[PDB]
Design a protein around this ligand. Structure first.
Ligand SMILES: C=CC1=C(C)[C@@H](Cc2[nH]c(/C=C3N=C(/C=C4\NC(=O)[C@H](C)[C@H]4CC)C(C)=C\3CCC(=O)O)c(CCC(=O)O)c2C)NC1=O
Ligand SMILES: C=CC1=C(C)[C@@H](Cc2[nH]c(/C=C3N=C(/C=C4\NC(=O)[C@H](C)[C@H]4CC)C(C)=C\3CCC(=O)O)c(CCC(=O)O)c2C)NC1=O
Ligand SMILES: C=CC1=C(C)[C@@H](Cc2[nH]c(/C=C3N=C(/C=C4\NC(=O)[C@H](C)[C@H]4CC)C(C)=C\3CCC(=O)O)c(CCC(=O)O)c2C)NC1=O
Ligand SMILES: C=CC1=C(C)[C@@H](Cc2[nH]c(/C=C3N=C(/C=C4\NC(=O)[C@H](C)[C@H]4CC)C(C)=C\3CCC(=O)O)c(CCC(=O)O)c2C)NC1=O
Ligand SMILES: C=CC1=C(C)[C@@H](Cc2[nH]c(/C=C3N=C(/C=C4\NC(=O)[C@H](C)[C@H]4CC)C(C)=C\3CCC(=O)O)c(CCC(=O)O)c2C)NC1=O
Ligand SMILES: C=CC1=C(C)[C@@H](Cc2[nH]c(/C=C3N=C(/C=C4\NC(=O)[C@H](C)[C@H]4CC)C(C)=C\3CCC(=O)O)c(CCC(=O)O)c2C)NC1=O
Ligand SMILES: C=CC1=C(C)[C@@H](Cc2[nH]c(/C=C3N=C(/C=C4\NC(=O)[C@H](C)[C@H]4CC)C(C)=C\3CCC(=O)O)c(CCC(=O)O)c2C)NC1=O
Ligand SMILES: C=CC1=C(C)[C@@H](Cc2[nH]c(/C=C3N=C(/C=C4\NC(=O)[C@H](C)[C@H]4CC)C(C)=C\3CCC(=O)O)c(CCC(=O)O)c2C)NC1=O
Ligand SMILES: C=CC1=C(C)[C@@H](Cc2[nH]c(/C=C3N=C(/C=C4\NC(=O)[C@H](C)[C@H]4CC)C(C)=C\3CCC(=O)O)c(CCC(=O)O)c2C)NC1=O
Ligand SMILES: C=CC1=C(C)[C@@H](Cc2[nH]c(/C=C3N=C(/C=C4\NC(=O)[C@H](C)[C@H]4CC)C(C)=C\3CCC(=O)O)c(CCC(=O)O)c2C)NC1=O
Ligand SMILES: C=CC1=C(C)[C@@H](Cc2[nH]c(/C=C3N=C(/C=C4\NC(=O)[C@H](C)[C@H]4CC)C(C)=C\3CCC(=O)O)c(CCC(=O)O)c2C)NC1=O
Ligand SMILES: C=CC1=C(C)[C@@H](Cc2[nH]c(/C=C3N=C(/C=C4\NC(=O)[C@H](C)[C@H]4CC)C(C)=C\3CCC(=O)O)c(CCC(=O)O)c2C)NC1=O
Ligand SMILES: C=CC1=C(C)[C@@H](Cc2[nH]c(/C=C3N=C(/C=C4\NC(=O)[C@H](C)[C@H]4CC)C(C)=C\3CCC(=O)O)c(CCC(=O)O)c2C)NC1=O
Ligand SMILES: CCC1=C(C)[C@@H](CC2=N/C(=C\c3[nH]c(C[C@@H]4NC(=O)C(C)=C4CC)c(C)c3CCC(=O)O)C(CCC(=O)O)=C2C)NC1=O
Lengths: 164, 177, 238, 164, 177, 164, 164, 68
């Protein structure tokens, strides 16, 4: 769970050192950003029915071959569990906007991701298609502020780079 | 390890619930007096060396049997181990105060310490009196009620941080008991 | 006539210097020792469970990737960290060859031989972290604090060094996670004659390599040998 | 040299990770503090003749036994090399105000400190007496600002805690 | 390792000189456009996966002999090693850009890489063409002159950060040459 | 290069043992099979223009979405390099029929396979579609013998299991 | 217990690999030999009263000095325990003919052999004399077949080479 | 073109001198030290102490009227 405080406390603990001015300095960086990266968590928390519906069918629009019988996304509960997965991923992005770190993305969606989707034949391109669609559906002055728009997209492209 | 920001995320992940302004105002309050927290921790790092000296010598000042021949803090090798252990405990309490969460205090410090001291023969009563003296020093240094040294700050209230470190210290005490 | 002055176009030094055929001795000396140290794991002909690389199909190839950038990082060391390695590896290689003043000179001339000896001997008599399982939560905290202190030199001064690196591409730290997670299950599931064989040489290894007459530290390692197995030397890093 | 950027870059490098939003967050903490911890370096840089003279004789005022023949600080070059040492320590404090880290104090004054002063009979209490005198000679509204007064004293008490 | 704040401290420690406003204004300028630096590095982390696939495939698009049988990037095992190495180099260049100093790039990455590639038989020319393509991508992503993707920001000039990362990339190129 | 002799020689060498009757026994197993697993290498060597043409377009028949502009297999040299890859894989299967081992498949097509196709967006399902088509296009009494048909399909399904 | 299957299963397990065509190949080598190396176990099992009597006194015929008082083989139970040992060794040879491996010879007669006979003064030349006599008392067309005669002698000379 | 021919000829000779026998590389090693010490050092106990450490620097000095 790499946050900004877990980074400095374990670095001071590996050296056996008290929290010095280096370690105190990093926490005020989680004061100036964190006044406005939590408004993105407001935008994600109240809009999450619509943003995972709008991104859930974007991958099926790009990849219509999944819905074939015998193919990957055969029946209806395939699609239900796929929308479940997009909801899970946007929940971890909502968590990462709140910790100020990529920890909840890492140890809950990214660690061991490639060793599930390969053995279950889930195409990772279908996963990155929804997140890439959500990244460019956002325009800055309508949905959030300027500080929120960059930090919300930065956790999305981090998961895009991690998934493929 | 976790901090104060991560614990609401862990608590909300076991609901499959998005976090919003139902509970983000507590984190915004953690942010707003976050500068008070950096004012708070620095007073313990400034006086960390005197705190262990005043704690461990007070332990013997209330219990002279630890240095009777055979006692736990008797010889020169054992005194260094006890003065080392006191400062390790103070270091982890300062970690937990800077983090806003007692996660780093549990697993890396207190997980398995009680029966470590039981196997070594370390008396628990003197250990509890050693952490509590440091607690009394820490709550005096947080609120700037120290009789020997005063520091410079902006004025206001800090009982929230004094209470957080007071809850951390007897959390240390309950694990080794 | 040299490659430096203004007379020549980029062709020089087509010959064996005394450098290179010194270092090619140490290559062979390290390999003929790793052979003899791996030859104890495969004792009778079957490959034992110690010498299994992977369990996913592509865990072995990824462990080869991780183990090739492993020892490239040893070459990316400062001159202060070059020199600190051999002068304690020579120290610890004396402790391995107790007598046999033939070996006292053999490990003292050659520089990659002594680095291989102190790691092959602890891999051969199984005195590592990941081979010993604490028989109780008692030893788990003992070995936790040794791991805490022994990873302080892996992050010296707040900054992490490259010697604590865990992956060099994305996903590689996760592969190395799962591979280290399978090895912990395999060490907790071995034979009853091997869990009490690694139990004793761990006590002896800690007592000779790190105690050095301190009658407390022996009296700690005899009670708790997973805390004895969990301590490395200085220039291993991590 | 533990600064705020050396802490996050090596933490990202130990994991093999690109600089994510955690690592970008710590650097703006070195923007809000660092507008005012560098005015303390101005106060220390132009006043350093007087603050090491005023603290140089404070240890001799507390410990007048050093100046005895046969004792520690016997002749005049003893005192000259002692004032040299106080100048060296305040220079490292001036460096630490500028990095935003305790690195130049650590690897240039603190590492190997105890293994010199013990073998050369230099009493560390005489060293901490000058730094403790400089810590309380400072009053906040005359010499610097409020942000500068806390961060200048924090690097002093860190060295006080490290020396003894 | 060092950063931009530490290098003035190392340079001034070899003078026995206190640092003041003779050279602190350069650090205050490092601070003031420090938010531009965080805007700068994020554009490379956003496109890090496309950068290596545009770089290494362009290397073969200009040199088809690497995949001729016997070539360095020929088989399936060697292609993964080269795609791994490119992203390692990009990761260290991003470390050096975030740090403001090329100290972390030298010792942990470039120290001993040239004769490592010499001993492996890795051709240097194709490697130089591989880092330079990534340099051309990075200076387009810093200044937002990328033809395929545009990002959102506050307006202004960023040629100083583009120049810093351009100086880091051929510093990588000079060490492996 | 795990063949049947590399398996026993390194096992005898790890123990420091001469080649005993165990090690001599394994080599006659490479006599009774190997009279007929090399006729499969004859069938693969003279028919390889047709079997990689017939399997090369099977993946494009299953996955016609690849040929879209902006998609994975955009232009003509995409398809040329894809047929190159199917030729490479069937060459390693032809090698594995000849060693009596999975060595040339492993260290030349399987090691590091997943860390190329993920970063270059090559879908592994398109790779296993061709090999699965080649596995069931084979009927036993027309193309080869009975010993050859099982051992040719066994190296194909091994690569199918390894790729996904 | 190095048999032909213990050699390949542990080699596949050290690499984390499924049993491939290399590992399947070694087992049919334990089909073609093993039809006729088990007739040697028939010859050894029904004739073992006579072959350890005929070899038991061969070492005493070569080494008559053992039977002296004060010497190695002093009294009658010395000779009884010596014939016991020759029976034990031929039992392990009978086991090795059945596993197709030198495992039961190794871990039951060969491991720790030299650290008993040296400390108990049992001369190993007297042990190899009986096994060498049994090796050349065998002539091929009378006792067994041609496949059995070579593999029965090969386990004898392996123990001869291991004992000295 | 003659300077190029003399280039390539001098380039082959450098490979041939770097590839000779182990008994001849350490025979030319010693008479180089002796040659420099008698022809150019002349009692200057520094220049001998340079030529013994480095005899290719002793071999690389000519007389005056050779030119080049
Ligand atoms: C907390 C983090 C978290 C995640 C990141 C996801 C990741 C994830 N997805 C799946 C699991 C799945 N994901 C899908 C989705 C798809 N497959 C198809 O058939 C469609 C093509 C595609 C829609 C995009 C399906 C169908 C399963 C169930 C597996 C299966 O039925 O084969 C599973 C197995 C358990 C399950 O059924 O949910 C997990 C752990 N789930 C999590 O809990
Ligand atoms: C928290 C995450 C979050 C998002 C990423 C967006 C995603 C999003 N966009 C739209 C819906 C829309 N969004 C826009 C906005 C834009 N279209 C453009 O062409 C401009 C570039 C850009 C900013 C002006 C427009 C014009 C629509 C209506 C048409 C449409 O559906 O695209 C909707 C439907 C309801 C709505 O308008 O909100 C949603 C959920 N909203 C969110 O709550
Ligand atoms: C990460 C967390 C962490 C800790 C908390 C300590 C815990 C700890 N303390 C001791 C070891 C010890 N601890 C004490 C301490 C005391 N005896 C008393 O009565 C007093 C209450 C107290 C001093 C204040 C003594 C005296 C020893 C040495 C025992 C002996 O040699 O007699 C040991 C054994 C190792 C050693 O001998 O040094 C350990 C693991 N170490 C850690 O790594
Ligand atoms: C021989 C008998 C003997 C004693 C009984 C103790 C005396 C003693 N002092 C304190 C109490 C304290 N000790 C300190 C420590 C310090 N004060 C400073 O300002 C310095 C920076 C630093 C040491 C140099 C502090 C801050 C307190 C809290 C009260 C106070 O402000 O003085 C306590 C804790 C009260 C409690 O138990 O709850 C005790 C027992 N020491 C002894 O030696
Ligand atoms: C590493 C360097 C560094 C620090 C140490 C802190 C330093 C610090 N503390 C405060 C500011 C303050 N600090 C305190 C704290 C206290 N006041 C008291 O009377 C008690 C002694 C103590 C309680 C723990 C209070 C009450 C304020 C003003 C109110 C507030 O900031 O919320 C301020 C003013 C800015 C602000 O208003 O937030 C600063 C710069 N910040 C830094 O950047
Ligand atoms: C390439 C360099 C090289 C060396 C420096 C030596 C070092 C060395 N010797 C042995 C192995 C051995 N080494 C010795 C020698 C000695 N053992 C003693 O008890 C005496 C103290 C000492 C010198 C008399 C003996 C007798 C063995 C076999 C049994 C044993 O390990 O003790 C082993 C382990 C191999 C094995 O046992 O399987 C190694 C690495 N061998 C090498 O290949
Ligand atoms: C860059 C970081 C840096 C430091 C922190 C100091 C630390 C330091 N001090 C001394 C060295 C010294 N320090 C003193 C000072 C004193 N001893 C006395 O006799 C007096 C009681 C007392 C004055 C307070 C003296 C006299 C020496 C010289 C050693 C000696 O003469 O015994 C030395 C040995 C080299 C020297 O002579 O300067 C070093 C490294 N110097 C540094 O370069
Ligand atoms: C910390 C920094 C760090 C690095 C820079 C790399 C450096 C590096 N690369 C390779 C190894 C390699 N590197 C290449 C790369 C190439 N061949 C080319 O012509 C292209 C120029 C280039 C691809 C872009 C290849 C092909 C191999 C494998 C050699 C082979 O097996 O044929 C190896 C040996 C380990 C291995 O086999 O994987 C190392 C240490 N690793 C590190 O840890
Ligand atoms: C077969 C032949 C073949 C080629 C010749 C190359 C084509 C190519 N493209 C770029 C150049 C580039 N490549 C990228 C990379 C990307 N652009 C994006 O916006 C995406 C995010 C990301 C890949 C998905 C960028 C940003 C540039 C800089 C120019 C530009 O903005 O397009 C360069 C570098 C120019 C130089 O050498 O200086 C080359 C050689 N690729 C090939 O395959
Ligand atoms: C981790 C999250 C995080 C970030 C990514 C940055 C995000 C960020 N960048 C800028 C602000 C800016 N960013 C840029 C940078 C650029 N503008 C361009 O035209 C180029 C594309 C690019 C050059 C590299 C400029 C020019 C400004 C405004 C001037 C300035 O800030 O100094 C601002 C406004 C605040 C300010 O004025 O400083 C913020 C919040 N900060 C954060 O807290
Ligand atoms: C000896 C063993 C061996 C292999 C197993 C293969 C594996 C392999 N394939 C590719 C490489 C490739 N493979 C494809 C194939 C495809 N991508 C598409 O666009 C289509 C959807 C799909 C057809 C099925 C393409 C296009 C490349 C070039 C990479 C690219 O252009 O992006 C590469 C990179 C080098 C190259 O260009 O060939 C390698 C090593 N090649 C080998 O040498
Ligand atoms: C070395 C690998 C190798 C193969 C896997 C096959 C693959 C293959 N099959 C066919 C072509 C054919 N293959 C068959 C055979 C069969 N169809 C059935 O329905 C039966 C189940 C089965 C055995 C009787 C038939 C009937 C055709 C002609 C119709 C067709 O193309 O499918 C062809 C075209 C020319 C030919 O007939 O050979 C090829 C290359 N051939 C090879 O050389
Ligand atoms: C399963 C494998 C297996 C073996 C290979 C043998 C090996 C073996 N032989 C002996 C033990 C012995 N072997 C002998 C034999 C001899 N000594 C003499 O006096 C004669 C010269 C000579 C006859 C050739 C004797 C006498 C003992 C008993 C030890 C003694 O009395 O000194 C022992 C000690 C136990 C015992 O008494 O049997 C063992 C383990 N036994 C086994 O169980
Ligand atoms: C670059 C640095 C390097 C490594 C780290 C390893 C990692 C490694 N071990 C392997 C594979 C492997 N490993 C073992 C066991 C192991 N092998 C032995 O010779 C002895 C004595 C062993 C116990 C230690 C076996 C039995 C195999 C299967 C191949 C074989 O040897 O027959 C394989 C092959 C996987 C495959 O073919 O699918 C790899 C990549 N290999 C390397 O080249």
């Amino acid at each position: 769970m790499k946050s900004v405080i877990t980074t400095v406390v374990s670095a001071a603990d590996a050296a056996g050192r008290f929290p010095s001015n280096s370690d105190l300095e990093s926490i005020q960086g989680n004061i100036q950003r964190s006044a406005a990266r939590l408004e993105a968590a407001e935008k994600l928390a109240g809009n999450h029915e619509a943003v995972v519906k709008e991104a859930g069918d974007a991958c099926f629009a790009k990849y219509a071959y999944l819905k074939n019988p015998g193919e990957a996304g055969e029946n209806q509960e395939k699609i239900n569990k796929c929308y479940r997965d997009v909801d899970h991923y946007m929940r971890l992005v909502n968590y990462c906007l709140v910790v100020g770190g990529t920890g909840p993305l890492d140890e809950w969606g990214i660690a061991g991701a490639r060793e599930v989707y390969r053995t279950l034949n889930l195409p990772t391109s279908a996963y990155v298609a929804s997140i890439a669609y959500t990244r460019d559906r956002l325009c800055v002055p309508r949905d959030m502020s300027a500080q929120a728009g960059v930090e919300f997209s930065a956790y999305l492209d981090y998961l895009i780079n991690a998934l493929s | 390890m976790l901090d104060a920001f991560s614990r609401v995320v862990v608590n909300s992940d076991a609901k499959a619930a998005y976090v919003g302004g139902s509970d983000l105002q507590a984190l915004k309050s953690f942010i707003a007096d976050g500068n008070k927290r950096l004012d708070a921790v620095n007073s313990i790092v400034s006086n960390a060396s005197c705190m262990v000296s005043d704690a461990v010598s007070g332990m013997i000042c209330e219990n002279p049997g630890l240095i009777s021949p055979g006692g736990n803090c008797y010889t020169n090798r054992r005194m260094a181990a006890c003065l080392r252990d006191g400062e390790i405990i103070l270091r982890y309490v300062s970690y937990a105060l800077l983090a806003g969460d007692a996660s780093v205090l549990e697993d890396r410090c207190l997980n398995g310490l009680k029966e470590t001291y039981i196997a070594l023969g370390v008396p628990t009563n003197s250990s509890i009196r050693a952490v509590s003296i440091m607690k009394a020093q820490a709550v005096a240094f947080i609120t700037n009620t120290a009789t020997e040294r005063k520091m410079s700050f902006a004025a206001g209230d800090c009982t929230s941080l004094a209470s957080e470190v007071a809850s951390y210290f007897d959390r240390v005490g309950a694990a080794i008991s | 006539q040299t490659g430096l002055v203004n007379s020549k176009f980029s062709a020089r030094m087509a010959k064996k210097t005394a450098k290179q055929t010194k270092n090619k001795v140490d290559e062979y000396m390290a390999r003929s020792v790793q052979r003899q140290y791996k030859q104890a794991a495969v004792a009778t002909g079957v490959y034992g469970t110690q010498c299994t690389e992977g369990t996913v199909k592509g865990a072995a190839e990824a462990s080869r990737s991780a183990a090739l950038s492993r020892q490239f990082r040893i070459k990316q060391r400062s001159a202060f960290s070059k020199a600190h390695d051999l002068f304690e590896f020579r120290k610890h290689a004396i402790i391995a060859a107790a007598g046999c003043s033939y070996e006292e000179k053999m490990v003292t001339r050659f520089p990659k031989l002594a680095a291989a000896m102190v790691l092959g001997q602890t891999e051969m008599m199984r005195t590592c972290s990941r081979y010993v399982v604490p028989e109780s939560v008692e030893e788990e905290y003992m070995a936790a604090s040794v791991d805490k202190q022994m990873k302080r030199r892996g992050a010296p001064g707040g900054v992490y060094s490259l010697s604590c690196a865990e992956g060099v591409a994305k996903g590689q730290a996760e592969i190395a996670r799962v591979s280290a997670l399978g090895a912990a299950y395999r060490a907790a599931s071995k034979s009853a004659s091997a869990v009490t064989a690694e139990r004793y040489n761990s006590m002896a290894y800690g007592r000779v390599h790190f105690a050095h007459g301190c009658s407390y530290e022996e009296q700690q390692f005899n009670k708790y040998p997973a805390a004895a197995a969990a301590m490395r030397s200085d220039s291993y890093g991590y």
